[PDB]
Each structure stands twice: as structure tokens, then as C-alpha cells.
Design an enzyme around this catalytic site. Structure first.
Site, PDB file in Angstrom:
ATOM      1  N   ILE A  89      19.989  68.194 -56.695  1.00 55.71           N
ATOM      2  CA  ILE A  89      20.539  68.301 -55.345  1.00 55.71           C
ATOM      3  C   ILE A  89      19.588  67.753 -54.277  1.00 55.71           C
ATOM      4  O   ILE A  89      19.691  68.118 -53.108  1.00 55.71           O
ATOM      5  CB  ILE A  89      20.921  69.763 -55.003  1.00 55.71           C
ATOM      6  CG1 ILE A  89      19.690  70.678 -55.025  1.00 55.71           C
ATOM      7  CG2 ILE A  89      21.972  70.278 -55.975  1.00 55.71           C
ATOM      8  CD1 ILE A  89      19.925  72.021 -54.376  1.00 55.71           C
ATOM      9  N   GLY A  90      18.662  66.877 -54.686  1.00 58.85           N
ATOM     10  CA  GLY A  90      17.753  66.215 -53.767  1.00 58.85           C
ATOM     11  C   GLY A  90      16.387  65.893 -54.340  1.00 58.85           C
ATOM     12  O   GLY A  90      15.951  66.517 -55.305  1.00 58.85           O
ATOM     13  N   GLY A 129       8.701  66.378 -54.893  1.00 58.48           N
ATOM     14  CA  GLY A 129       9.331  66.363 -56.199  1.00 58.48           C
ATOM     15  C   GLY A 129      10.835  66.554 -56.102  1.00 58.48           C
ATOM     16  O   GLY A 129      11.431  66.294 -55.055  1.00 58.48           O
ATOM     17  N   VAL A 130      11.438  67.019 -57.200  1.00 58.86           N
ATOM     18  CA  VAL A 130      12.884  67.201 -57.314  1.00 58.86           C
ATOM     19  C   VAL A 130      13.282  68.644 -56.990  1.00 58.86           C
ATOM     20  O   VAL A 130      12.497  69.572 -57.189  1.00 58.86           O
ATOM     21  CB  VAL A 130      13.372  66.851 -58.740  1.00 58.86           C
ATOM     22  CG1 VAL A 130      14.891  66.901 -58.822  1.00 58.86           C
ATOM     23  CG2 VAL A 130      12.854  65.480 -59.157  1.00 58.86           C
ATOM     24  N   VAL A 131      14.507  68.812 -56.479  1.00 60.72           N
ATOM     25  CA  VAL A 131      15.124  70.117 -56.258  1.00 60.72           C
ATOM     26  C   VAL A 131      16.443  70.177 -57.030  1.00 60.72           C
ATOM     27  O   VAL A 131      17.351  69.387 -56.777  1.00 60.72           O
ATOM     28  CB  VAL A 131      15.393  70.381 -54.759  1.00 60.72           C
ATOM     29  CG1 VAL A 131      15.961  71.779 -54.559  1.00 60.72           C
ATOM     30  CG2 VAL A 131      14.122  70.200 -53.942  1.00 60.72           C
ATOM     31  N   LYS A 189      12.711  74.217 -57.201  1.00 58.58           N
ATOM     32  CA  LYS A 189      11.861  73.197 -56.600  1.00 58.58           C
ATOM     33  C   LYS A 189      10.734  72.858 -57.573  1.00 58.58           C
ATOM     34  O   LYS A 189       9.783  73.625 -57.718  1.00 58.58           O
ATOM     35  CB  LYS A 189      11.293  73.727 -55.284  1.00 58.58           C
ATOM     36  CG  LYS A 189      10.603  72.700 -54.405  1.00 58.58           C
ATOM     37  CD  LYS A 189      10.055  73.377 -53.156  1.00 58.58           C
ATOM     38  CE  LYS A 189       9.692  72.366 -52.086  1.00 58.58           C
ATOM     39  NZ  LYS A 189       9.261  72.977 -50.799  1.00 58.58           N
ATOM     40  N   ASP A 193       6.293  72.558 -39.782  1.00 56.34           N
ATOM     41  CA  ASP A 193       7.385  71.620 -40.037  1.00 56.34           C
ATOM     42  C   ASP A 193       8.741  72.268 -39.761  1.00 56.34           C
ATOM     43  O   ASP A 193       9.661  72.198 -40.583  1.00 56.34           O
ATOM     44  CB  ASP A 193       7.317  71.074 -41.470  1.00 56.34           C
ATOM     45  CG  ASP A 193       8.202  69.834 -41.679  1.00 56.34           C
ATOM     46  OD1 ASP A 193       8.488  69.116 -40.691  1.00 56.34           O
ATOM     47  OD2 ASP A 193       8.603  69.578 -42.839  1.00 56.34           O
ATOM     48  N   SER A 234      10.451  64.467 -51.746  1.00 59.45           N
ATOM     49  CA  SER A 234       9.165  63.765 -51.621  1.00 59.45           C
ATOM     50  C   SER A 234       8.091  64.362 -52.543  1.00 59.45           C
ATOM     51  O   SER A 234       7.516  63.646 -53.369  1.00 59.45           O
ATOM     52  CB  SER A 234       8.681  63.747 -50.160  1.00 59.45           C
ATOM     53  OG  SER A 234       7.716  62.733 -49.945  1.00 59.45           O
TER      54      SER A 234
END
Ligand SMILES: O=C(Nc1ccccn1)[C@@H]1CCN(C(=O)CCc2ccccc2F)C1
Ligand SMILES: [Cl-]
Length: 345
Positions: A28-29, A34-36, A51, A144, A32
Site C-alpha cells: 500500500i505504498g 522502505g515498503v508499507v 512498515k 514532519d 522512501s
């Protein structure tokens, strides 16, 4: 019908691993770092986001260490974490899945030429300020804050702050990098390259979110720092030499257009609540110490409607928990409890 079974450690509570099986795994994304993934826990059927991040062998993961300390209704919940594997090690953060973000909701309204109802602006901003009040009490700055990192359950109107990948404890005296925080939501001191900034950068960023929700678009856009500062100076006016020093560029020539303070009322559309505008002006200040604290923002009159005993969500449901403050959460200014916790609560 594929099932992955791992031995994972709970986020809160004592370090006691257990067997956790999850299914319906899907990407699902790519964040940057890593992967989610999204997955469903076999036992309860509850949805989670995983995550996956490359583990540095040298030191323990800062995001993990911070996440394990945090326990709050307006912060994404770390259910489990486990290690896996290239021949390198990956840290996996198993988080309670939340279906929407403020970014995605706001954009749906925006490209339909509509403004989000103020009730939702109040609900979302209040819960953000609670989450900031909590983490700041530990001296932890998010660094952030942006609409993409504000998770939303549309049914319950619950907002949860996520993505603590940039988060850090700020200790007075110790310098910190100025290149954190996303474009549009960066405080002026960060643009000026300050390394002695405080948690008040999050307050500026929150102020940018508020204005964006009111305007229907980012208030301080620009591809460069220079462009951003011009948009800031257009609203706040030219910063005085006094204000410049408190932001802390030090060595580096000044030289901005000498523009007058554009009155805040003309920034927003005609029927924008006066208290919303008042709140913005007290969040988006040049002088970092002059900005409201998160807890002071919660107690601002803009959020009075939320403390009204008859308030309900547009979908008929009750509001989420808004008043269950802890001593930790109130420590910045305990006297404010007399405003924050209303009689009916
Ligand atoms: O990611 C989500 N929830 C979530 C994520 C982590 C922890 C808890 N909840 C929702 C589900 C899908 N969402 C999206 O914004 C689209 C997915 C996506 C697109 C681009 C970049 C990152 C990303 F996650 C928001
Ligand atoms: Cl909504």
C-alpha cells in the site's frame, strides 16, 4: 488463503514475544525508508499496516524506541514489531491500520471546489494539538507534521499522528539538523538553517495545516526556500532584525522585500470564523517562543464548540474522546484543565 506466522514483540508492556499470524498481505505504498504492507490478523480479523525498514546493525532504530514509549488515543498504535529478511535484517512495525488521511480527505473537498466543514477542522486540529502536547511533554519533536501524516477514521472522526521516522528528543544545547520537515510546512527558522530550534517547529507546521484546511490549498507554497519566505512575508510582513535573531540564521545577509503586514482577515474567504483566523495568527509567528504551546491551542476559543455538551458528529454519532487528559499530557500547564475538561465531562 496464504498465512505468514512470526514471533513478534508487543509495542507496549514487557518484552514478551508471541506468535502472530496475518493474511491478505498487499503493498500500500513505498515510504522512501522502505515498503508499507496492509494485512489482516488471523485471530481477531483486525487490519494492520506493516512498515518494513532496513535495520542498521550499528544502533537500534530511533523510530521504534520512541514508538514503544508512546501511548495515546491520537497517536498511531504500535501493536507488534518483529525482525525478518539480500542477507540484511529488516525491522517490521505492525501498526493499527487507519483507512484515511487528512491529505486525501482535504484533496477530495479541494478539487470539488469545496471547503471542509469547520466542525471537522476543529475536530482534526484539536486532536493534532493533543498528540503534540503529549509527545512534547517527553521533549520529543515530530519534525514532519503534514496532512499525509495525519490518519483519520472517517466513521469515528478520530485523528492519529503517524510516521515518527523523523522524530527526535530535542535537548537544549545539542544541535539538530535543519533539513527535516516537508516543503510548505517548514518553520522559518528551519528555512534559515537554524540548528538550535525547539518543539515549536511542530506548532508552525500545525498552523500551516489549519490554514490549508481553511483555504483549500497550502498557504506557504514554493519550490525553493526563497519562494516560501516570500509567501510568508506576504502574510506576516517583513521580519524585524529582532525577529530574525530569534529564528537564528546568524551569518548570512538579510535583504528581503520591505512589505507591510497583510491583515489576516483578507487572507481567508469572507465567512471564515474569526476565531480560526485568530488561532492561525498565534500559531504562525516568526518568533518561535511567541507561538502558542499545543496545550494552549487546545484551550483556544476556536475549539469551544467541541466542549459544548450537545455537540455531535454530522453522521449522528458522538464525538470521539476529547477530554480524557492525563497528568503527563497536562504537565506543561496544569491550570488549563479547568478549560480543557468541561463540566459535563
Ligand atoms: O496508509 C494508510 N493507513 C495507515 C498507514 C500506516 C499506519 C496506519 N495506517 C491509509 C491507507 C492508504 N493510504 C494512502 O494514503 C494511500 C497509500 C500511500 C500512497 C502514497 C504514499 C504512501 C502511502 F501509504 C492511507
Ligand atoms: Cl469527513
Amino acid at each position: 488463503s496464504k498465512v505468514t506466522t512470526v514471533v513478534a514483540t508487543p509495542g507496549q508492556g514487557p518484552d514478551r514475544p508471541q506468535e502472530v499470524s496475518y493474511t491478505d498481505t498487499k503493498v500500500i505504498g513505498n515510504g522512501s525508508f522502505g515498503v508499507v504492507y496492509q494485512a489482516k490478523l488471523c485471530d481477531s480479523g483486525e487490519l494492520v499496516a506493516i512498515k518494513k525498514v532496513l535495520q542498521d546493525k550499528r544502533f537500534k532504530n530511533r523510530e521504534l524506541q520512541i514508538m514503544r514509549k508512546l501511548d495515546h488515543c491520537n497517536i498511531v498504535r504500535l501493536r507488534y514489531f518483529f525482525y525478518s529478511s539480500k542477507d540484511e535484517v529488516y525491522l517490521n512495525l505492525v501498526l493499527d491500520y487507519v483507512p484515511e488521511t487528512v491529505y486525501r480527505v482535504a484533496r477530495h473537498y479541494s478539487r470539488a471546489k469545496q471547503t471542509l466543514p469547520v466542525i471537522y477542522v476543529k475536530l482534526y486540529m484539536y486532536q493534532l494539538f493533543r498528540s503534540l502536547a503529549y509527545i512534547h511533554s517527553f521533549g520529543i519533536c515530530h519534525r514532519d507534521i503534514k496532512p499525509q501524516n495525519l490518519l483519520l477514521d472517517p466513521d469515528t472522526a478520530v485523528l492519529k499522528l503517524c510516521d515518527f521516522g523523523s522524530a527526535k528528543q530535542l535537548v537544549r544545547g545539542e544541535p539538530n539538523v535543519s533539513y527535516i520537515c516537508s516543503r510548505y510546512y517548514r518553520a522559518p527558522e528551519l528555512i534559515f538553517g537554524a540548528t538550535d530550534y525547539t518543539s515549536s517547529i511542530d506548532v508552525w507546521s500545525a498552523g500551516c495545516v489549519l490554514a490549508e484546511l481553511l483555504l483549500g490549498q497550502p498557504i506557504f507554497p514554493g519550490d525553493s526556500g526563497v519562494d516560501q519566505l516570500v509567501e510568508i512575508i506576504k502574510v506576516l510582513g517583513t521580519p524585524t532584525r529582532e525577529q530574525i535573531r530569534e529564528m537564528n540564521p546568524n551569518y548570512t545577509e538579510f535583504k528581503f522585500p520591505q512589505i507591510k503586514a497583510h491583515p489576516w482577515t483578507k487572507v481567508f474567504r469572507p465567512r471564515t470564523p474569526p476565531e480560526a483566523i485568530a488561532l492561525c495568527s498565534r500559531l504562525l509567528e516568526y518568533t518561535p517562543t511567541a507561538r502558542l504551546t499545543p496545550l494552549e491551542a487546545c484551550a483556544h476559543s476556536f475549539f469551544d464548540e467541541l466542549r459544548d455538551p450537545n455537540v455531535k458528529l454530522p453522521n449522528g454519532r458522538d464525538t470521539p474522546a476529547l477530554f480524557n487528559f492525563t497528568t503527563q499530557e497536562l504537565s506543561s500547564n496544569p491550570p488549563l484543565a479547568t478549560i480543557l475538561i468541561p463540566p459535563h465531562a
